[PDB]
């Protein structure tokens, strides 16, 4: 038959619209954190020294 995850007693879930809204907000927060961290890593590597 079809496969679904084992039954975990979690209670009722909110509708798809609320899932989508929270997913979009979490995506925004994740992107902000990623870009801030990546700029932090990129900063020390800007200046280089000859010889």
């Amino acid at each position: 038959n079809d496969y679904i995850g084992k039954n975990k007693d979690v209670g009722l879930k909110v509708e798809l619209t609320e899932d989508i809204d929270r997913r979009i907000m979490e995506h925004r927060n994740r992107f902000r954190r990623l870009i801030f961290n990546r700029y932090v890593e990129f900063l020390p590597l800007l200046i280089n020294y000859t010889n």
Binding site: N1, I4, N7, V14, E15, L16
Partner: protein
Amino acid sequence: MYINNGRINYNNEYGYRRGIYREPFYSDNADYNTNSKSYYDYLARFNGFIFELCDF
């Protein structure tokens, strides 16, 4: 069709899930609105307690 012999027993011949897998009897491609309690309900419960305190 025969009686349950005066003893009640619960069984589900046609269930949604069988262990990990999913039975083909019922459909899942449906989305229902879920309405929980808001802050006003928290206030209502607190007001119920305050009402009992005032009665006491």
